[PDB]
Each structure stands twice: as structure tokens, then as C-alpha cells.
């Protein structure tokens, strides 16, 4: 009815039709590959999370839950240690197996020393030994950077390995 919409009705030019209407189809999963392989495309995200043994919400659900078949003290809260949790599904075991193995691969946290770092700490040790780090930090001539005892201790530790 609008003059702009009537204009394209009176024209011979076609509309910029875009066929995008696709309801009832759910978003496809990316991110985790393990979840993607075991994710079915028909079920809801609640049904898929429950099937894969995960939790969609760590809180309450603000409604009913579907029922398809009929069913057949501060010391002990602060000093306690919960014993993790079992994996109910092979997917959760697969997720857990990957996390531990990958963390083991990426575990080289200790660092070596560079040419300057090694010569720096080596010169301090040759004069003050290896146990007196407090007097090591107080020597202005050799400790030019004024590293404290804790930094010099970490330098020596990294040199040992």
C-alpha cells in the first residue's frame, strides 16, 4: 500500500526474495568436537545434555520436567574435600580422558635460564654460597637488579634442573 511498496509492485523487477524460513530446526553444534559427534539433531538441548551425562543448568529448572515413562557445622563444610564425581556416560569419560592426557602433555612448567640469567645467578652463588640468599640480595655490586631473596631462590632452583 505504501508508495515504496507499490513501486516494486508496479515494476517489472523481481523482489530481493531470501528463502531463510527454517523453523523447528535447531542450531548445529560447534566448539567441542566430542559433543558434536554424540549430539543428535532432533532432541532438545536439555534432552541432549541429559543423554550425554552433562548438566545444562547448575540451578533449579523454572517449570516441569517431561515424564515419558512411569517410574518403577562449619568444620565439616570447610575442611572437607569432596571426592570429585563419577562419569555416568562414555562421553563424559571421553571428555575426562582428554583433559587429563592433554594436561599431562602440557605440564613442563619449570623454566631454564638464559645466558644473562645464568651468569647473573652463577656469580652470586660463587661468592655467597647456595644457602645464604638474604645476604645475596643485599650485595649491591653483584645484585645490580636488586632482586630479593625469593627471586634469587627461584633463579637457583631453575638452574638446578
Amino acid at each position: 500500500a505504501n508508495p515504496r511498496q507499490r513501486n516494486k509492485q508496479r515494476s517489472g523487477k523481481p523482489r530481493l526474495t531470501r528463502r531463510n524460513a527454517n523453523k523447528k530446526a535447531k542450531a548445529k553444534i560447534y566448539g567441542n568436537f566430542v559433543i558434536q559427534q554424540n549430539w543428535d539433531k532432533h532432541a532438545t538441548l536439555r534432552q541432549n545434555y541429559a543423554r550425554l551425562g552433562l548438566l545444562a543448568t547448575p540451578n533449579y529448572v523454572t517449570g516441569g520436567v517431561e515424564k515419558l515413562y512411569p517410574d518403577p557445622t562449619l568444620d565439616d563444610v570447610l575442611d572437607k574435600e569432596i571426592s570429585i564425581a563419577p562419569a555416568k556416560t562414555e562421553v563424559v569419560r571421553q571428555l575426562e580422558e582428554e583433559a587429563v592426557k592433554k594436561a599431562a602433555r602440557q605440564s613442563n612448567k619449570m623454566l631454564p635460564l638464559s645466558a644473562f640469567e645464568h651468569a647473573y645467578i652463577q656469580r652470586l652463588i660463587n661468592k655467597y654460597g647456595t644457602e645464604d640468599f638474604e645476604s645475596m640480595a643485599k650485595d649491591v655490586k653483584l645484585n645490580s637488579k636488586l632482586f630479593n631473596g625469593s627471586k634469587l631462590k627461584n633463579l637457583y632452583i631453575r638452574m638446578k634442573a
Partner: protein
């Protein structure tokens, strides 16, 4: 008592003085800030060491001309 009277001020019945130093006449002997001195003021500057390592890197990569080879290019 306050006698409920009036003090003749109720509504009912040097333009250019000299400078006065009432605070700066004396001299404060101690520093104003008691905060501890950081170690950065007794050690070589870490800002320059950042640039030195950055310059030393690009010297290895050939981004900056070294002083010896700067002169050769000039002549």
C-alpha cells in the same frame, strides 16, 4: 534563661590587607609522604632495559642498522 530579648541585629524589633603567612611562617622539616621508597630508584631503569632488549632483538632480525654498519652505508 535567654531572656527572649533582642540584640539590635534581628530584623524584628582594610579592602586590601597585607599577605598573612599563618602557616608558612615555619618550615616543615620532614617529608610530606611517609610511603616507603620503591627499589626502582636504586636500580637500573627497567624501561630502558625493555627497549634495549627490543632493540637487541631487531638488531638480530636486521630491522635496525647497527652503528658500525650505519657508518658504512653513509659512506
Amino acid at each position: 534563661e535567654i531572656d527572649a530579648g533582642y540584640s539590635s541585629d534581628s530584623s524584628t524589633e582594610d579592602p586590601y590587607p597585607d599577605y598573612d603567612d599563618f602557616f608558612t611562617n615555619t618550615v616543615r622539616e620532614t617529608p610530606l609522604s611517609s610511603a616507603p621508597e620503591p627499589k626502582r630508584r636504586f636500580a637500573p631503569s627497567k624501561h630502558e632495559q625493555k627497549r634495549i632488549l627490543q632493540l637487541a632483538y631487531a638488531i638480530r632480525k636486521g630491522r635496525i642498522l647497527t652503528s658500525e654498519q650505519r657508518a658504512e652505508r653513509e659512506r
